[PDB]
Structure 1
Protein backbone atom coordinates (compact mmCIF):
# COMPACT_ATOMS: atom_id res chain seq x y z
CA UNK A 1 0.00 0.00 0.00
CA UNK A 2 1.43 3.41 -1.17
CA UNK A 3 2.94 5.90 1.26
CA UNK A 4 0.54 8.81 0.66
CA UNK A 5 -2.10 6.21 1.48
CA UNK A 6 -0.58 5.39 4.87
CA UNK A 7 -0.39 9.10 5.68
CA UNK A 8 -4.17 9.43 5.30
CA UNK A 9 -4.77 6.34 7.43
CA UNK A 10 -2.80 7.95 10.25
CA UNK A 11 -4.60 11.30 10.37
CA UNK A 12 -7.81 9.29 10.12
CA UNK A 13 -6.75 7.09 13.03
CA UNK A 14 -5.71 10.23 14.90
CA UNK A 15 -9.21 11.65 14.43
CA UNK A 16 -10.95 8.42 15.43
CA UNK A 17 -8.94 7.98 18.62
CA UNK A 18 -10.65 10.61 20.78
CA UNK A 19 -9.12 10.00 24.22
CA UNK A 20 -5.76 10.09 22.40
CA UNK A 21 -4.74 6.90 24.23
CA UNK A 22 -3.14 5.40 21.11
CA UNK A 23 -5.85 2.72 20.90
CA UNK A 24 -9.39 2.80 19.41
CA UNK A 25 -12.28 1.72 21.67
CA UNK A 26 -16.09 1.51 21.67
CA UNK A 27 -16.19 4.91 23.40
CA UNK A 28 -14.11 6.69 20.75
CA UNK A 29 -15.96 5.27 17.77
CA UNK A 30 -19.30 6.20 19.31
CA UNK A 31 -18.09 9.70 20.19
CA UNK A 32 -16.71 10.64 16.77
CA UNK A 33 -19.52 8.72 15.10
CA UNK A 34 -22.14 10.78 16.95
CA UNK A 35 -20.57 14.07 15.87
CA UNK A 36 -21.13 12.91 12.29
CA UNK A 37 -24.64 11.60 12.59
CA UNK A 38 -25.21 8.17 13.93
CA UNK A 39 -23.87 6.07 16.69
CA UNK A 40 -23.39 2.58 15.42
CA UNK A 41 -24.94 1.11 18.51
CA UNK A 42 -23.07 -0.96 21.26
CA UNK A 43 -24.59 -3.88 19.39
CA UNK A 44 -22.56 -3.21 16.23
CA UNK A 45 -19.68 -1.48 18.06
CA UNK A 46 -18.50 -4.73 19.67
CA UNK A 47 -18.28 -6.50 16.31
CA UNK A 48 -16.09 -3.67 14.97
CA UNK A 49 -13.54 -4.33 17.70
CA UNK A 50 -14.17 -8.06 17.20
CA UNK A 51 -12.42 -7.78 13.83
CA UNK A 52 -9.00 -7.34 15.42
CA UNK A 53 -7.06 -10.23 17.05
CA UNK A 54 -6.07 -8.12 20.07
CA UNK A 55 -5.63 -4.40 20.91
CA UNK A 56 -6.64 -1.96 18.17
CA UNK A 57 -3.68 0.35 17.59
CA UNK A 58 -2.63 2.01 14.34
CA UNK A 59 -0.74 -1.15 13.36
CA UNK A 60 -3.86 -3.34 13.54
CA UNK A 61 -6.09 -0.61 12.03
CA UNK A 62 -3.91 -0.39 8.90
CA UNK A 63 -3.75 -4.17 8.82
CA UNK A 64 -7.49 -4.86 8.83
CA UNK A 65 -7.80 -2.26 6.07
CA UNK A 66 -5.37 -4.01 3.72
CA UNK A 67 -7.03 -7.39 4.21
CA UNK A 68 -10.37 -5.83 3.34
CA UNK A 69 -9.02 -3.81 0.41
CA UNK A 70 -6.23 -5.83 -1.19
CA UNK A 71 -6.69 -8.90 -3.33
CA UNK A 72 -8.61 -7.25 -6.17
CA UNK A 73 -7.87 -6.69 -9.87
CA UNK A 74 -7.04 -3.65 -11.97
CA UNK A 75 -9.88 -1.74 -13.56
CA UNK A 76 -8.51 -3.20 -16.80
CA UNK A 77 -8.68 -6.85 -15.74
CA UNK A 78 -12.33 -6.63 -14.71
CA UNK A 79 -13.03 -4.55 -17.81
CA UNK A 80 -11.48 -7.40 -19.76
CA UNK A 81 -13.48 -10.13 -18.02
CA UNK A 82 -16.76 -8.38 -18.85
CA UNK A 83 -15.59 -8.10 -22.47
CA UNK A 84 -15.34 -11.88 -22.75
CA UNK A 85 -19.14 -11.98 -22.58
CA UNK A 86 -19.61 -9.23 -25.15
CA UNK A 87 -18.42 -10.65 -28.51
CA UNK A 88 -19.95 -7.79 -30.50
CA UNK A 89 -17.83 -5.51 -28.28
CA UNK A 90 -20.73 -3.07 -27.91
CA UNK A 91 -19.38 -2.27 -24.43
CA UNK A 92 -22.60 -3.45 -22.80
CA UNK A 93 -24.28 -6.69 -21.72
CA UNK A 94 -28.01 -7.41 -21.65
CA UNK A 95 -29.24 -7.05 -18.07
CA UNK A 96 -30.84 -10.51 -18.12
CA UNK A 97 -27.67 -12.18 -19.27
CA UNK A 98 -25.29 -10.65 -16.72
CA UNK A 99 -27.82 -11.27 -13.92
CA UNK A 100 -28.01 -14.88 -15.07
CA UNK A 101 -24.25 -15.30 -15.11
CA UNK A 102 -23.98 -13.86 -11.62
CA UNK A 103 -26.85 -15.73 -10.01
CA UNK A 104 -26.84 -19.23 -11.53
CA UNK A 105 -23.25 -19.87 -12.58
CA UNK A 106 -19.77 -20.08 -11.12
CA UNK A 107 -19.92 -19.13 -7.46
CA UNK A 108 -23.64 -18.29 -7.32
CA UNK A 109 -24.57 -14.96 -5.73
CA UNK A 110 -27.34 -15.38 -3.15
CA UNK A 111 -30.54 -13.33 -3.42
CA UNK A 112 -29.01 -10.75 -1.08
CA UNK A 113 -25.78 -10.21 -2.99
CA UNK A 114 -27.93 -9.66 -6.09
CA UNK A 115 -30.05 -6.87 -4.63
CA UNK A 116 -27.03 -5.00 -3.30
CA UNK A 117 -25.02 -5.49 -6.49
CA UNK A 118 -27.80 -4.13 -8.69
CA UNK A 119 -29.35 -1.50 -6.45
CA UNK A 120 -26.78 0.86 -8.00
CA UNK A 121 -25.39 -0.67 -11.22
CA UNK A 122 -25.50 1.24 -14.56
CA UNK A 123 -28.59 0.03 -16.47
CA UNK A 124 -30.54 1.73 -19.28
CA UNK A 125 -32.79 0.19 -21.93
CA UNK A 126 -31.97 -3.30 -20.71
CA UNK A 127 -28.31 -2.53 -21.23
CA UNK A 128 -25.80 -3.00 -18.41
CA UNK A 129 -22.81 -0.72 -18.85
CA UNK A 130 -19.97 -2.82 -17.52
CA UNK A 131 -17.35 -0.14 -18.18
CA UNK A 132 -18.98 2.54 -16.02
CA UNK A 133 -19.69 -0.18 -13.45
CA UNK A 134 -16.05 -1.23 -13.45
CA UNK A 135 -15.09 2.34 -12.55
CA UNK A 136 -17.68 2.43 -9.79
CA UNK A 137 -16.31 -0.84 -8.33
CA UNK A 138 -12.82 0.59 -8.11
CA UNK A 139 -14.40 2.97 -5.58
CA UNK A 140 -12.85 6.07 -7.16
CA UNK A 141 -16.37 7.24 -7.91
Structure 2
Protein backbone atom coordinates (compact mmCIF):
# COMPACT_ATOMS: atom_id res chain seq x y z
CA UNK A 1 0.00 0.00 0.00
CA UNK A 2 2.41 2.92 -0.62
CA UNK A 3 3.10 3.50 -4.27
CA UNK A 4 -0.62 2.79 -4.69
CA UNK A 5 -1.36 5.96 -2.72
CA UNK A 6 0.78 8.02 -5.09
CA UNK A 7 -1.40 6.54 -7.86
CA UNK A 8 -4.44 7.16 -5.66
CA UNK A 9 -3.99 10.90 -5.68
CA UNK A 10 -3.84 10.61 -9.47
CA UNK A 11 -7.21 8.99 -9.10
CA UNK A 12 -8.12 11.90 -6.91
CA UNK A 13 -7.18 14.62 -9.37
CA UNK A 14 -9.25 13.34 -12.28
CA UNK A 15 -12.33 13.00 -10.10
CA UNK A 16 -11.92 16.47 -8.51
CA UNK A 17 -12.68 18.54 -11.64
CA UNK A 18 -13.15 21.99 -10.10
CA UNK A 19 -10.38 21.08 -7.62
CA UNK A 20 -12.93 22.24 -5.03
CA UNK A 21 -10.66 20.46 -2.69
CA UNK A 22 -13.15 17.65 -2.83
CA UNK A 23 -15.20 15.32 -4.83
CA UNK A 24 -18.45 17.23 -5.00
CA UNK A 25 -21.43 14.93 -5.56
CA UNK A 26 -21.19 16.56 -8.97
CA UNK A 27 -17.51 15.88 -9.42
CA UNK A 28 -18.46 12.24 -9.87
CA UNK A 29 -21.16 12.72 -12.54
CA UNK A 30 -18.28 14.56 -14.14
CA UNK A 31 -15.51 12.37 -15.28
CA UNK A 32 -18.05 9.58 -15.46
CA UNK A 33 -20.17 11.40 -18.02
CA UNK A 34 -17.03 12.79 -19.72
CA UNK A 35 -15.97 9.17 -19.48
CA UNK A 36 -18.70 6.60 -19.06
CA UNK A 37 -22.13 5.50 -18.03
CA UNK A 38 -23.21 8.12 -15.54
CA UNK A 39 -24.72 6.42 -12.46
CA UNK A 40 -28.37 6.92 -11.52
CA UNK A 41 -29.31 9.68 -9.09
CA UNK A 42 -29.61 7.66 -5.89
CA UNK A 43 -26.68 5.54 -7.06
CA UNK A 44 -24.58 8.69 -6.71
CA UNK A 45 -26.16 10.00 -3.54
CA UNK A 46 -25.98 6.75 -1.62
CA UNK A 47 -22.43 6.51 -2.98
CA UNK A 48 -21.21 9.25 -0.65
CA UNK A 49 -22.81 8.15 2.58
CA UNK A 50 -20.39 5.23 2.23
CA UNK A 51 -17.95 7.70 3.79
CA UNK A 52 -18.43 9.31 7.23
CA UNK A 53 -17.88 12.93 6.25
CA UNK A 54 -17.05 15.25 3.27
CA UNK A 55 -14.41 13.43 1.23
CA UNK A 56 -11.08 15.06 0.79
CA UNK A 57 -8.52 12.41 0.08
CA UNK A 58 -7.95 10.92 3.42
CA UNK A 59 -11.57 9.95 3.42
CA UNK A 60 -10.95 8.78 -0.17
CA UNK A 61 -8.15 6.47 0.91
CA UNK A 62 -10.42 5.49 3.72
CA UNK A 63 -13.42 3.97 2.05
CA UNK A 64 -10.81 2.26 -0.13
CA UNK A 65 -8.94 0.44 2.59
CA UNK A 66 -12.09 -1.31 3.84
CA UNK A 67 -12.95 -3.04 0.57
CA UNK A 68 -9.46 -4.58 0.58
CA UNK A 69 -9.18 -5.97 4.11
CA UNK A 70 -9.12 -9.77 3.74
CA UNK A 71 -6.75 -9.85 0.76
CA UNK A 72 -4.86 -13.14 1.12
CA UNK A 73 -1.45 -12.72 -0.48
CA UNK A 74 -1.22 -13.37 -4.20
CA UNK A 75 1.11 -16.21 -3.21
CA UNK A 76 -1.24 -17.84 -0.70
CA UNK A 77 -3.80 -17.57 -3.49
CA UNK A 78 -1.66 -19.03 -6.27
CA UNK A 79 -0.28 -21.52 -3.77
CA UNK A 80 -3.84 -22.40 -2.81
CA UNK A 81 -4.54 -23.55 -6.38
CA UNK A 82 -1.42 -25.66 -6.92
CA UNK A 83 -2.69 -27.40 -3.79
CA UNK A 84 -4.92 -29.22 -6.28
CA UNK A 85 -2.43 -29.34 -9.15
CA UNK A 86 -0.62 -32.42 -7.85
CA UNK A 87 1.65 -32.34 -10.87
CA UNK A 88 3.14 -28.88 -10.83
CA UNK A 89 1.61 -27.71 -14.10
CA UNK A 90 0.56 -24.33 -12.73
CA UNK A 91 -2.64 -25.37 -14.42
CA UNK A 92 -6.00 -27.07 -13.92
CA UNK A 93 -8.28 -28.88 -16.34
CA UNK A 94 -11.09 -26.38 -16.66
CA UNK A 95 -13.92 -28.89 -16.19
CA UNK A 96 -12.15 -29.65 -12.94
CA UNK A 97 -11.76 -26.40 -11.08
CA UNK A 98 -15.13 -25.72 -12.64
CA UNK A 99 -16.81 -28.58 -10.79
CA UNK A 100 -14.36 -27.85 -7.99
CA UNK A 101 -16.19 -24.60 -7.34
CA UNK A 102 -19.76 -24.97 -8.47
CA UNK A 103 -20.18 -28.08 -6.31
CA UNK A 104 -17.43 -27.87 -3.72
CA UNK A 105 -17.09 -26.08 -0.42
CA UNK A 106 -19.88 -23.64 -0.85
CA UNK A 107 -22.06 -24.15 -3.79
CA UNK A 108 -20.53 -21.54 -6.02
CA UNK A 109 -23.89 -20.27 -7.13
CA UNK A 110 -24.73 -20.33 -10.82
CA UNK A 111 -24.45 -16.57 -11.23
CA UNK A 112 -21.15 -16.10 -9.41
CA UNK A 113 -19.90 -18.98 -11.51
CA UNK A 114 -20.52 -17.24 -14.82
CA UNK A 115 -19.38 -13.73 -13.86
CA UNK A 116 -16.04 -15.32 -13.00
CA UNK A 117 -15.01 -17.58 -15.88
CA UNK A 118 -16.39 -14.93 -18.21
CA UNK A 119 -12.83 -13.65 -18.62
CA UNK A 120 -11.31 -16.87 -17.37
CA UNK A 121 -7.81 -17.16 -18.88
CA UNK A 122 -8.74 -20.71 -19.87
CA UNK A 123 -7.15 -22.29 -22.98
CA UNK A 124 -6.96 -25.85 -24.34
CA UNK A 125 -9.03 -27.26 -21.49
CA UNK A 126 -6.25 -25.86 -19.27
CA UNK A 127 -6.65 -22.96 -16.82
CA UNK A 128 -3.73 -20.88 -15.75
CA UNK A 129 -4.72 -20.09 -12.14
CA UNK A 130 -1.35 -18.47 -11.98
CA UNK A 131 -2.13 -15.70 -14.45
CA UNK A 132 -5.68 -15.64 -13.09
CA UNK A 133 -4.57 -14.81 -9.58
CA UNK A 134 -2.05 -12.41 -10.96
CA UNK A 135 -5.17 -10.84 -12.50
CA UNK A 136 -7.64 -11.47 -9.69
CA UNK A 137 -5.79 -8.68 -7.88
CA UNK A 138 -2.18 -7.74 -8.47
CA UNK A 139 0.67 -7.37 -10.95
CA UNK A 140 0.05 -6.92 -14.65
CA UNK A 141 -0.91 -3.35 -15.64
CA UNK A 142 -3.23 -0.41 -14.77
Q: Secondary structure at the match of 2:68?
A: coil
Determine if contact 1:25/1:49 at 8 Å carries over to the other structure. no
Q: C-alpha separation between the residues in 2 aligned to 1:3 and 1:79?
A: 23
2:128 is equivalent to residue 129 of structure 1: yes
Deviation of 1:48 (Å): 2.0
Q: Deviations over 1:3-34 (max 9, x none)?
A: 33222222322331223333323211001212
Relative to the length of structure 2, the TM-score reads 0.84
Pairs aligned (count): 140
Deviation of 1:81 (Å): 0.7
Determine if contact 1:26/1:42 at 8 Å carries over to the other structure. no
Instruction: Describe the shift of the 1:102–1:10 C-alpha distance in structure 2 as closer, same or farther (beyond 3 A).
Output: same
Which stretch of structure 1 is more off in the superposition, 23-32 or 43-52? 43-52
Deviation of 1:75 (Å): 2.2
> Structure 1 or 2: larger helix share?
1
Task: For structure 2, list consecutive stretches of 5 or more residues without a partner in the other structure.
Answer: none
Q: Deviations over 1:105-133 (max 9, x none)?
A: 22332222111110011212222121121
Q: Secondary structure at the match of 1:92?
A: coil
Q: C-alpha separation between the residues in 2 aligned to 1:88 and 1:11?
A: 43
Q: Deviations over 1:27-81 (max 9, x none)?
A: 1100121222332232421232132233222122101111123421222211111
Relative to the length of structure 1, the TM-score reads 0.84
Q: C-alpha separation between the residues in 2 aligned to 1:140 and 1:91?
A: 17
Q: Secondary structure at the match of 1:71?
A: coil
Instruction: Describe the shift of the 1:107–1:12 C-alpha distance in structure 2 as closer, same or farther (beyond 3 A).
Output: same
Which stretch of structure 1 is more off in the superposition, 43-52 or 22-31? 43-52
